[model samples]
Target: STGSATTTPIDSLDDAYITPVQIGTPAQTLNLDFDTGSSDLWVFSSETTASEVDGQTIYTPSKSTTAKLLSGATWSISYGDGSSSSGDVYTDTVSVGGLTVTGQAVESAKKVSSSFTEDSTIDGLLGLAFSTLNTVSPTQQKTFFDNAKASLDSPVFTADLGYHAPGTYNFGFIDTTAYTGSITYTAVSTKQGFWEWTSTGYAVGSGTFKSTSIDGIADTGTTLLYLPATVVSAYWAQVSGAKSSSSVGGYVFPCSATLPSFTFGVGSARIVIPGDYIDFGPISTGSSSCFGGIQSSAGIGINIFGDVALKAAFVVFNGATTPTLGFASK
Candidate 1:
């Protein structure tokens, strides 16, 4: 079980979402965002009224024979996007892939917004980020990782992102099979609970953008890499025939042609993103070439290194001993 983790995109969950193995016999399916923004396992429940919950997948406890609910504790969570949900605490025998971790804590939401209700294919989110931001109170503190760590075959866990595909996210063990064994790391900074640091620069194909030094947090919750205006402009300069458009309140591009390969060097470790991600096609008001991999975060201030950048390599988050991200080859 001590090997490199394998990650594959769940194409059914859109390019951004990844599927987690269901927990328990006749296991319930769970779609997780693999978020680093918050810590908790939240699933939309059938109890949620149709009006409150919109497009998200809800968990039905009746499907699981081992499901149990907490008597007194109830919970609600709000996101930076202004969306929120509230539910009751519950416990059950959970299984992911071939592994099963019993007595796993779960949140069953009774109320959810349209953003969550709309996505019925996604069962819920599994917060694999650090524990400092855990929503569970100290008295009722329970995390999927914390509860499952003790039963894992190895202490380390690995997530592998596929090529233009949603990759697999593995827990309990680190799979060394897919990697080349050259691991690099960056020291973790204590800022806003995000795994953040400064980057030396970015590389598109063989082209390097040396004019600006990018600083931002790497997050799994976000779907795309958000870059500053200057960087976005510079990237567009290189891609020919690329046009920008608007999608998801931001710039998007469409270019059927091959795009240049890009890479980001955080200290010594380098992450390279394919061109399909860069050629997102123009779908915004700005008429900017809206690159695929990089998006314009003109006002967001903080740059977000989303899952598109994360799916390219093997990432090991070392929070048990210290705050650090250990990078390995895929």
Candidate 2:
């Protein structure tokens, strides 16, 4: 109950981090996206039409002696970026890292959107958000973390996301060795099934943090930092060639252009996002073009402190208290 599970990065894609999970009686291993932004553990399954699965691995509950159909229960979900999935449910043994939670609801995806189907490697999502956000019909589903928390030595998990390097997600126990200095804490609101918090102000480069209030969610699944359009434009203004191309969208700049560092406030603590992370990388890395990792969440109406921002610091999702976020430099 006091043990901790470690998470790591996947391939060349740094946007989402994956952790190995074992499901069913014999323990079929699958790579899952550990997402704190949503609460649904759905996976590609044998029930999925062969045409829809592409190269992804599938989960077959019928093959597992301990697996059982969840009666009439089903799940369907659509995210803001348009990825979606729908499937039936099964109660099976779910294990993450080294922690096992039996009788877990594992949603098997019968169909997935173009976004998910195009992503051939991702087997499914291991949601880290609260179970209250689960989408199972008739009765709500609980995430593996939800079930594991009560039995954990402490009901908390920490995200030590890295840039172009390996990272770790420590569950059940917070590793002080993973971070430096003191962690500045701030309250979180889980009403929307998100680990959302607000920053009192922000600044670019070495400039002062203007008391510009920003309401946002800390999303490990999302790839970029999305902020108000005005804030995005202000950041772009500092770079000569950086401009929001109507065609490409977001902020595009010459790969040689310089990028400014960013700092955002959580209470009185100032968190810095390095300039290189903000510049992202060469358009496709094989080419010479570059794009900003920061975007405008204007129409979406929510700011997301995503991978670009999270990899800059050590983050702790402290559920045992007031749903607080503890931040420190890595």
Candidate 3:
């Protein structure tokens, strides 16, 4: 079976993308962040505290006849940005796009971090990373894709993230019309429970390509692209007024500065990110300086190919028995 879902950006900066998902028997639809960085399907629910509930929608399991409490099951997850959530578990009928899964684990949030509460657009997060990364205790549960893979015509999903626009996520099969040129395939390491892969090198603007190995995860949850300090510095140096500011944090430059496009290689294929994508936005209203979309991952432990990079190309998460990743120009 094949399914297609539309993902829309939450804000002008494209801080995150949200996709509609239906949960429970009667089907309570909520917009959730389809995060490839984590592995726990959690949601704001009736169980959440009133003070914690802001403008987000909540899932009430009691309203669904198909809901079954997963006794003794609980989950908690913390993100690199310090945002977190914890909840109890329930098994219910959940549907995304047109694909339906029976008895899917639906974690209902009881406690949520302030960042989550403030982000009123997203109702919760649906993790697409390997189930090994699931934070559930006692009995870990598989992701929606993992549980539904057997029924999929092919064990694969595609991410077509857009630049300040809505994109589509295709499950079960690849859409030939979505991308241009041939797809370049690369080995993926699931040992860390992420869609981790290696890039052959990178280039700044029209500069010479640097042949260096860059190992990073393709994380849809992250807002910006983060690489080693060397790579980040090299790119920023090309900009006339760019500098690493401790006050604003990371690299910031005059809004009028001419930014350069970034290019990264997958095998022999090179994907180029437009210069406009690097100018994230002004640090503050009426401010002349803007924060960079690409920053140093020196303290992050690992590089992250987040939305800033993902939106530049078409990404394929091949979930075959032996997994691999595919990249292509769009």
Which residue pairs of candidate 3 clash? Answer: none
TM-score of each: 0.82, 0.95, 0.99
For TM-score, candidate 1 versus 3, the one ahead is: 3
lDDT of each prediction vs. the true structure?
A: 0.65, 0.84, 0.94
Give one digit per residue, the lDDT tens place, for model 3 in 202-229. Answer: 9999999999999999999999999999
**Candidate 2 global Cα RMSD:** 1.6
Ranking by TM-score: 3, 2, 1
For this target, which candidate reaches the highest lDDT against the unseen true structure? Answer: 3
Residue-wise C-alpha lDDT for candidate 1, range 1-330, written one tens digit per residue = 222223445442234565664754467666656666667777877887778665655678778788887667677678756777777777787666666667777778787777777655556667765556656543354566656676676555666666656566666565667577586777777567677767668877887546346777767677677888777766666766543455446543444456776688766667777766555444444544444667777777788877767766777665555567766667
Between the candidate structures 2 and 3, which one is better when assessed by lDDT?
Answer: 3
Which rank order by lDDT, best down to worst? 3, 2, 1
Model 2 misplaced regions, further than 4 Å: 11-13, 284-287
Measured by TM-score, how close is model 2 to the native structure?
A: 0.95
Best-fitting candidate, scored by TM-score: 3
Window of ten residues with lowest summed lDDT in model 3: 277-286
Candidate 3 deviant stretches above 4 angstroms: none
